[PDB]
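Please check this protein record:
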Amino acid sequence: KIEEGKLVIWINGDKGYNGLAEVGKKFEKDTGIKVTVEHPDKLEEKFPQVAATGDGPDIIFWAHDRFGGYAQSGLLAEITPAAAFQDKLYPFTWDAVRYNGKLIAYPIAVEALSLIYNKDLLPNPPKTWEEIPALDKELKAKGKSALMFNLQEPYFTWPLIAADGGYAFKYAAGKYDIKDVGVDNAGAKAGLTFLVDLIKNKHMNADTDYSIAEAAFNKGETAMTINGPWAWSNIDTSAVNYGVTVLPTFKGQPSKPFVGVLSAGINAASPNKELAKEFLENYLLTDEGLEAVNKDKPLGAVALKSYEEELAKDPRIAATMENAQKGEIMPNIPQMSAFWYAVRTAVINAASGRQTVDAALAAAQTNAAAKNIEKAKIAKLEADISAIKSASLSYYADESKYTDGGMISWVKKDGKIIINGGFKDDPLADKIENLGMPYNGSYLLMSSPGHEKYLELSILPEGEISKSGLDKLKNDYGNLIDITNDQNKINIVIKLL
């Protein structure tokens, strides 16, 4: 597996691997332990493969959002920074590296979109989204546009969509509710309507993508763009006198970009967890260590307070941190994949006029949340099935058979559950009386007085279950379940034995 007595570190090729290796050299000088910094290809996919088999690097550097997935597969050790060390980093960066209620990585850097503007065309950039239409008219009179940025990817359009109330997944305690998506609320509609209005009023074109926007800003054709630190060096080569500042407000509220946090995780299979902790806390996450990495290739804004104070001398870095603090931590759960595709489709459909804003987002809410909502409903239905089977078994323990009588019916009326026209189980032990009945339908348990094994439960759910949903029931039980009437009133019968 992983060789003890040493540190293998994986970081992406676009980061400062030379500087990190120099921090490694200071570590080997003080301790004798060699540090191998490599930047292999496809590092994001290679780690989950090799780490599951109990191999790989000791420390993996990657954007925090993948780490929640890694943690679910148990590939990451819980880190143990003392309170004194935690206060050296901005509190909001620690929230980006939590899964369950556990710290699962060290925050390194902080990144978010900003407003980039051409100082020659526009020495005072607009504070509000609302004033950009008038600005575009005044600039189109001189052959220039106000604002071009990538409209094809919801990462770039989300700051406006979220400003008045949009969100990806609600965050509560230390967990995301994968059932609560904020794509079709009034705030998200208002933000997307403003975006579409900009396009219908000819202030932007629905076909603008990353390359068109970057080319237009670099050739001084548009006064503003929206982009991240990765784009700065191509504007330097362009020689355009540019600035970087806070994103415009919408309805008086800041734009809310997604925040990406470069993070260092410790492989759960590492026999060098103490060495890795010592390296990350007392060598890398210092002014001297981050300086080493930044001088090789800049980090942007950093989570370490002391060095951020120094990098923030650069107003572009200060703006990145300000937009980040006003933004939304990108959720670190794998359910974001459905979020990205859903919102990407909605924006493209609404911007090109192929759908209304309401239809686009209603569909997107569905595409992002429906599967997870049903999965919860199926699980609660299966909980009821197991609860009914449990009580039926408990009855046999004390009484002759499964049911006392022949049949029992649960039906839900208007917020209450009714049982025949008389109480059945007749107990203080069972009764259950805690069936969610997630599809509000009817349950009917069947038995015939005699030799046992005739335990059949008939469920008549109200509400269409998906193919994926009904097929989950087929893999969970097998030949013991008969879905009849695949249309109208679907009927499900399970033999509880």
Q: What stands out?
A: The CA atoms of residues 259 and 425 lie 55 Å apart. Residues 373-495 form one domain. The chain is about 40% helix and 20% strand. The first strand starts at residue 7 and ends at 10.
